[PDB]
Every structure is written in structure tokens, then in C-alpha cells.
């Protein structure tokens, strides 16, 4: 597959995108973020593979950044593949309590840290994490970046160009619209929503996602 791409999307916020070859279908992209605070770096979702995680770490360290932590937004592999490698480098890895326990139940590498409430911050205010309820998975969380006004929605949100909800084998479809409404209730002054797959868009990505969820729910 083609290798990790990293592109600046705001002052101190970079989009990292990994790619998978899907036989029969084509190339599929997966997004996360790197957030900088002076020379400290925080990774929101790892890349989709251990080797693209290695490239992400090298991106940061070649720039003289110290990688302080990762947070993964649910237990699925496009969010967590790199937890094994970061653990091996002694980089703190974080999920929610629920995500950590799901990983453990499945015999997957676990983060070295977790948070218990519906809200938590990383980087002492830099990244606000929120659990809005089930949708894409029972455990999906979102990250709000108050300085850049970026909401990282992960797979709980769908890009404009997405006509469906994606992989729903672990989804709670009938809960999903309510969980997006919970995000809206936070009154974040969102100017960009970053989905787990596809292109970055505005806050109207939330309304789009509600439409898809309500349609599927029937």
C-alpha cells in the first residue's frame, strides 16, 4: 500500500492519513491527528498499521518533537494498531476505560493509561475527550481541540461523500443519532470536523451523519 501522509491543517494540527488496499473495491483511507504544543506532540488515533505508526513517530522525532501520548477513539484496529509499538517505545497510550477493557477481552494490546469519566483531557487542556454514547461502536469517543476549533469525530461521523454508515457490525444504529445530538449539545464552536475516513468538512458533517443514522434506523 502507499505510505503514510501527513499534512498541516491548522497551526499545530496535522492530519495523518494511512491507506489500505481493498481487493475488488480500491484504496481506502483512514485519518488521525497529530497535535503540537510547543515541541510536545500528541497523537489522536494511531495509523492503521504498525509500520505506518513507525513512520508517524519518525515524522515527529525528525522534527525534534517529543511524542507525549496517544489517545485511541475506540477499540477497532484503525484507531489502535499502533498501541503495541508506542507501548514498546514507552510512549503513554490512552483510551477510555471501556475501550481498554474491550481490547483486553479480545486479547489485544492494551493502553498503559485510561480515563474513567465521560470527559477527560489530554495535554493539560489541549485535547478535550468526550464520550457521547454508542454509534459506530459502543465505545466511540470524540476529541475537541479548543484552539484550532477542530472536532475529531473518528468513525462516529461520516464524511460528506459517504453515503452510508460504514462498517456497522459493532454499531448501535438506533442510538447513533442521539449520540451525535449529544455532541451538538456541547455547543463547541466547531469550524472543522475530521472524520475517521474521507475528507475534512464543516459542522454540517454532524447533520449528515444524523441523516445516515436515522435512515438506517428506518
Q: Please report, in range form, the residues annotated as the binding site for Ca(2+).
A: 70
36-45 burial by CB neighbour count: b if 16+ within 10 A, else e? bbeebbbbbb
Shortest CB 150 distance to a copy of itself, Å: 19
- Identify which of residues 37 and 77 has a Cβ nearer to a copy of itself in the complex: 77
> Contacts with a copy of itself: how many residues (CB under 8 A)?
27
Q: Sketch the per residue contact string, 138 through 157, with a copy of itself: x for CB under 8 A, - otherwise.
A: -----------------x--
Stretch that binds a copy of itself, among 14-22, 49-57, 99-107, 115-123 (CB under 8 A): 14-22
- Identify which of residues 24 and 64 has a Cβ nearer to a copy of itself in the complex: 24
Stretch that binds a copy of itself, among 53-61, 73-81, 181-189, 206-214 (CB under 8 A): 73-81
Among 6, 9, 28, 68, binds a copy of itself (CB under 8 A): 28
Exposed (0-12), middle (13-18) or buried (19+): which is 68, by Cβ within 10 Å? middle
Phi, psi (degrees; rounded to nearest 5) at 87: -55, -40
> Which helix (DSSP H) or strand (DSSP E) does residue 101 occupy?
helix 97-105
Among 76, 158, 197, 208, binds Zn ion (CB under 5 A): 76
Of residues 90, 134, 129, the one with CA closest to residue 112: 90
Is 49 within 8 Å of 37 (Cβ atoms)? no
Which distant-in-sequence residues (6+ apart) come within 8 Å of 183 by Cβ? 130, 132, 142, 151, 153, 206
Which residues form the interface with Zn ion (CB under 5 A)? 76, 155
Amino acid at each position: 500500500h502507499k505510505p503514510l501522509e501527513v499534512i498541516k491543517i491548522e497551526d499545530g494540527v496535522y492530519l495523518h492519513t494511512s491507506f489500505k488496499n481493498i481487493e475488488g473495491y480500491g484504496l481506502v483511507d483512514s485519518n488521525g491527528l497529530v497535535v503540537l504544543d510547543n515541541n510536545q506532540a500528541y497523537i489522536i488515533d494511531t495509523p492503521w498499521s504498525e509500520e505506518d505508526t513507525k513512520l508517524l513517530l519518525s515524522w515527529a522525532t525528525d522534527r525534534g518533537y517529543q511524542v507525549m501520548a496517544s489517545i485511541s477513539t475506540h477499540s477497532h484496529e484503525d484507531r489502535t494498531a499502533g498501541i503495541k509499538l508506542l507501548n514498546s517505545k514507552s510512549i503513554p497510550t490512552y483510551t477510555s476505560e471501556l475501550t481498554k477493557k474491550l481490547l483486553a477481552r479480545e486479547g489485544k494490546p492494551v493502553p498503559t493509561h485510561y480515563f474513567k469519566d465521560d470527559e477527560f483531557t489530554l495535554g493539560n487542556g489541549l485535547i478535550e475527550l468526550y464520550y457521547p454514547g454508542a454509534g459506530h461502536t459502543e465505545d466511540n469517543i470524540v476529541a475537541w481541540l479548543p484552539k484550532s476549533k477542530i472536532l475529531f469525530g473518528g468513525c462516529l461521523v461520516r464524511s460528506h461523500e459517504a453515503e452510508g454508515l460504514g462498517y456497522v457490525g459493532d454499531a448501535s444504529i438506533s442510538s447513533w443519532a442521539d449520540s451525535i445530538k449529544n455532541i451538538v449539545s456541547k455547543k463547541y464552536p466547531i469550524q472543522m470536523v475530521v472524520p475517521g475516513h474521507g475528507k475534512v468538512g464543516s459542522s454540517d458533517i454532524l447533520d449528515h451523519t444524523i441523516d445516515l443514522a436515522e435512515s438506517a434506523s428506518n
